[PDB]
Subunit: 681 residues, 2 copies
């Protein structure tokens, strides 16, 4: 229907008409965004159809798999983003449901009918689009390290096949696996678990090899000063860490070495137990009684979002498999899991345990670890206009900051094994997408009472410093304020004024400076010998003012970047600070895991997954500012979604049945082996 | 561009070990290929298709695969005359693609010297690989189109959306023009692992060096055996034994041992015809000074394949050679070049370093690192003195002894093994091997000869050809016939009794001795045919065994590498009485139980001499004999094949053919241009293959014996 002829344009992509087939060469090596956009004469009207799907006949004659983004926009202005991986090879059909069929508490659901076809993964945006007027349909590739290609043979709208009413019925086995689907590494019997443990014990290393120091550093590199703690240095023209014995060190590893995130909502909410959600309940074949052995794995989630529950009861199939696998005959399965986990990292060559490692691990003297704290309190707050952020100028913020960091110190006990502390994570500092996005904190704060809003009170001060008289501001901001007292009370800014931006930038820096000074001070008080690794900025939300402010205080600037790699264009700005950086989170996933959601970055298969992993880690290693990266996370998200937000991604280095993804492991081992020599030699 | 639909339109079909259901308008075919070594769907009309009226056209199939494994289909088209031709292609798991076979026009109308040519037009479709048969079929009468699945380990599936005849697109006249780059790579196509600059070679070497091991891991014995397994009598030589009700080898130190590794660890088969030649009279392996002066273009088509050849004065000019005997191409002889050897000197020969010695060293280390227990057949004798990786040795028995024939010229000549000169030449061959091996414990064993034309057990004529043809000859001048006369007289006393059994009217034994034309339809004689064929093979193996007993007494004799398509039971039986290990070549997806059950007759250990899987994503124009969807599938199919070797209680190992990909423009001898390499022409190991090999070799002892 839509193509077999339709008008289109391209953005950093050569399009050739070879037969009926659009060959798209995405110029994605050079350009961080590349696309072919399908725009008709008059905005498509699909009012006349119901219960239907948009289908693409896609091949990939390239030499890398392509994660394509499907963007469908309105005459109305709303947009929804979908994504899928197109493997190197011939044609498959990719479809997206636009109306009907599918609430379940899963970020991505099973298909609503059986096929050999591939459904796009729903990512973000406004789902319920305006079918009456569809402006554009864009296929884009974003933030790759390689040119990508796509062959489009046909685009069409199709009537959805017959609904499967049991698509959410017993999709989980008693092991937490995809019940209805076979997949690589699927456990069929409990005896497989016991058999795994025995086999794995054979291959597991105990100690670091002789080409690694005891702290996991470069035993054959230079020998810098031994401070007895992890620290930063420059060797040649590249940033490095230094281990406590003065060997060079780069941070590789895995986050969430803990069970806190491996639980899923059962649908129940002890003598007052009730089914709060029938749909949740029916997902799983097996859920034990509280009097059962494996009933030990029942938890409760106070707060839950994006699902048919705001609270309720949880179960952890991974923790259950741990008991099954390591807790034979009353054995301390937790302790055994920790010992296996430590050995795995040695064996895989990981130099550290990542963020959100369980305090259980902190007194270990085998593998280094990263510690963390969240700053929570009843202190006053500001808003990015949309996320609630700390009023960093409230004295109550320093009070809680100190207690937060103090807590961590007691966990760490001044151990050289602690590489450093993360404080907070992806705070809502603002997104530099527009004025409103960039300076939401400033804009929202400026219309609040200086008398009651400490952050605003500092804004007042700084602006008095620069402007002296309020009439002189009235010029630049193009406003008609009466007095510094009215300003102090609250100002509604002119969204379109450009001259005030220079000031907004002062105010955002000022807010950020206080944030990072407070936390830096707290670290000085409680863990003075340890590095402070920042606040883990998301690459989608890292205003330059916030980064700049952090550079004065942190030992290492942390970012999370869920991309195919660290592109030169994207990270060039780091050269203005000359500071070392770490990636707190990254991952690749694939649907061949039997999960319903590959995650944020998509590969063709486990082997592609590992190869893309290698490409990302190579980009980290070859970047002169970056000193490491941590994989998110250790364990696959539960197939029915983690209890907090329904996230059900293939993010695990191991599956729910405590089986390492083999291909990932071998990429990991390779990468860790050659990392020091690649960077420095 | 479509001429005519065959299925979209219905046509009559029959199935064979295959369930076909017409779900919607598609034929979904479930080949029952796990249980049945041949499964098929056969499309046949009431009257033979007449396609005479078409020219410059192709036959096209729109195919998906809803199964869990990729499927190599065989496409056989047969005509009214009983001629047949076989094409093959891999259909990956997934949706619909077009697979086509040109029936007329373009390159068909190879003189290229490539077993399989580049496509004659660029497309989003997949050309079938021409395999074998009578290609020039009668398009007046196409009797049947067969799609089959052959010797798999798994059930395969196929979805057929349409079959059609179509006009060929515009002929790309430049399809054989500059298809090779200076590295011997596919110039026009981008492929995974393609080298773009010489610097990448040096880059490659540095990186691989840090990853190469130079010594066996702790869990492997010095001779590559099972360090943690039982310890048996150490004889100081490789030998056979049983453990846990399964055949094994035993290394010199007494540890259990299975043979894994790769064939053709040498340069001899990495050369391709350049299209140049010389004044034949000036020829006395690079040509001499006087002959070089008469260099001329003998094949324009060959010359134009290449973007670059060096000049003889260039450093890389030393990689020119010469081939005295070539077939299946435009040249019967001519200049060759070795892009692989050129790459070795580029990679390892900087600053006049000993590039060959370094290649040998990296090769040994690669085998260690990849976990292979051995170097396979046709290892360059350069390696024989190595004390790091065990190796298989070989000889060919060649000479001017008398010969016998199958009665089919394409099958080839066979030694008259009752000719005393055959024994002289056997002895002399084995003696040469003995001087190369120098009694080294590192030599696992000796293969003598390879895929001799003993017969194919699929028709009486094919099976007993040597017997039939020899019976027709004179005892006076044909030793094998003199032996056949002896055995029949021993059995029948009087000719009259044989005349009865064979349904003949021979006047005298003197007639029999002079020459008999047997009755091809007579069945009673087949017991005698079996006796005669056994007797032939028995003397063959007895002679070789006695040679081995003289010169290499301490070392295993590994037989003569029978092809799985041509292994008469009589010959296998004869061999079992002499060899330490029975060797076979088997280019299939695996060792099927049904194919190899016969081994229980002899309770001997067996070895696979050669097997391979190839894929088109290597950038070569021919995936080979067994086809995968891509490099990853290729590795997975490798793994399955090796699992079937490891799981088989008679087999003690298998060798992969071969180390290096064949030249993209054909090996000089016969134009074979397959993706058979563990490594590419630029000395880059195929990463997926290496990873699968490492895992396989790691687990083999445990999997087989624990």
């Amino acid at each position: 229907t839509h193509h077999t002829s339709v008008d289109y344009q391209s953005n950093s992509a050569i399009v050739k008409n070879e037969n009926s087939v659009l060959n798209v060469q995405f110029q994605s090596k050079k350009n961080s965004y590349a696309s072919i956009v399908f725009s008709p004469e008059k905005p498509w009207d699909w009012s006349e159809f119901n219960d239907f799907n948009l289908a693409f006949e896609l091949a990939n004659p390239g030499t890398h798999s392509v994660q394509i983004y499907l963007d469908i926009s309105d005459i109305d202005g709303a947009n929804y983003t979908r994504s899928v991986n197109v493997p190197v090879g011939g044609y498959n059909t990719y479809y997206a449901k636009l109306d009907g069929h599918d609430t379940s508490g899963l970020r991505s659901n099973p298909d609503t009918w059986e096929s050999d076809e591939v459904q796009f993964i729903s990512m973000w945006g406004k789902k319920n689009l305006n079918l009456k007027g569809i402006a554009k349909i864009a296929i884009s590739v974003q933030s790759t390290l390689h040119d990508k290609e796509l062959a489009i043979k046909s685009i069409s709208l199709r009537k959805n096949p017959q609904f499967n009413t049991a698509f959410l019925t017993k999709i989980v086995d008693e092991f937490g696996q995809n019940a209805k689907q076979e997949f690589a590494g699927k456990v069929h019997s409990e005896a497989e678990l016991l058999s795994d443990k025995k086999q794995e014990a054979t291959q597991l290393l105990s100690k670091r090899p002789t080409n690694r120091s005891r702290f996991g550093g470069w035993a054959e590199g230079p020998k810098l000063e031994a401070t007895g703690y992890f620290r930063t240095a420059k060797y040649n023209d590249k940033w490095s860490l230094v281990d406590p014995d003065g060997y060079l060190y780069l941070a590789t590893g895995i986050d969430i070495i803990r069970l806190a995130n491996s639980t899923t909502l059962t649908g129940y909410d002890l003598k007052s137990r009730f089914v709060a959600s029938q749909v949740r309940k029916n997902l799983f074949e097996w859920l034990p009684d509280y009097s059962d052995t494996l009933g030990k794995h029942f938890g409760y989630r106070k707060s839950a979002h994006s699902g048919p529950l705001e609270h309720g009861e949880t179960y952890s199939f991974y923790a259950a498999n741990l008991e099954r696998k390591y807790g034979q005959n009353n054995a301390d399965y937790m302790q055994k899991w920790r010992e296996v986990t430590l050995d795995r990292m040695i064996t895989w060559g990981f130099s550290s345990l990542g963020n959100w490692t369980d305090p259980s691990y902190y007194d270990n003297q085998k593998v280094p670890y990263f510690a963390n704290g969240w700053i929570i309190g009843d202190f006053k707050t500001v808003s990015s206009g949309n996320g609630a952020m700390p009023d960093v100028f409230d004295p109550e913020f320093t009070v809680r900051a100190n207690e937060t960091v103090s807590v961590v110190a007691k966990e760490v006990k001044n151990s050289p094994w602690a590489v450093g502390v993360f404080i907070d994570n992806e705070k809502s500092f603002g997104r530099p997408d527009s004025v409103k996005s960039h300076y939401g904190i400033v804009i929202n704060t400026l219309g609040r009472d200086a008398k009651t809003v400490p952050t605003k009170a500092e804004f007042s001060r700084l602006m008095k410093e620069k402007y002296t008289d309020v009439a002189e501001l009235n010029k630049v901001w193009h406003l008609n304020l009466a007095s510094w007292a009215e300003f102090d009370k609250g100002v509604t800014i002119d969204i379109k004024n450009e001259e005030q931006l220079v000031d907004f930038s002062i105010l955002l820096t000022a807010y950020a400076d206080k944030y990072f000074s407070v936390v830096n001070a707290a670290m000085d008080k409680y863990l003075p010998n340890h590095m402070y690794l920042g606040a883990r900025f998301p690459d989608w939300g890292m205003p330059i003012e916030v980064v700049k402010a952090s550079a004065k205080y942190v030992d290492v600037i942390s970012f999370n970047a869920y991309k195919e790699g660290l592109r030169d264009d994207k990270w060039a700005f780091l050269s203005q600070f000359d500071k070392p950086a770490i990636i707190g989170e990254f991952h690749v996933g694939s649907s061949d895991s039997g999960l319903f959601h590959p995650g944020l970055i998509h590969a063709a298969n486990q082997q592609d997954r590992a190869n893309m992993y290698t490409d990302y880690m190579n980009s980290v290693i070859d970047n002169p500012y970056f000193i490491g990266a941590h994989w998110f996370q250790y364990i696959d998200s539960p197939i029915t979604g983690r209890a907090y937000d329904g996230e059900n991604y293939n993010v695990g280095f191991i599956s729910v049945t405590d089986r390492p993804y083999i291909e990932m492991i071998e990429a990991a081992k390779a990468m860790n082996e050659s990392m020091y020599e690649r960077r420095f030699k």
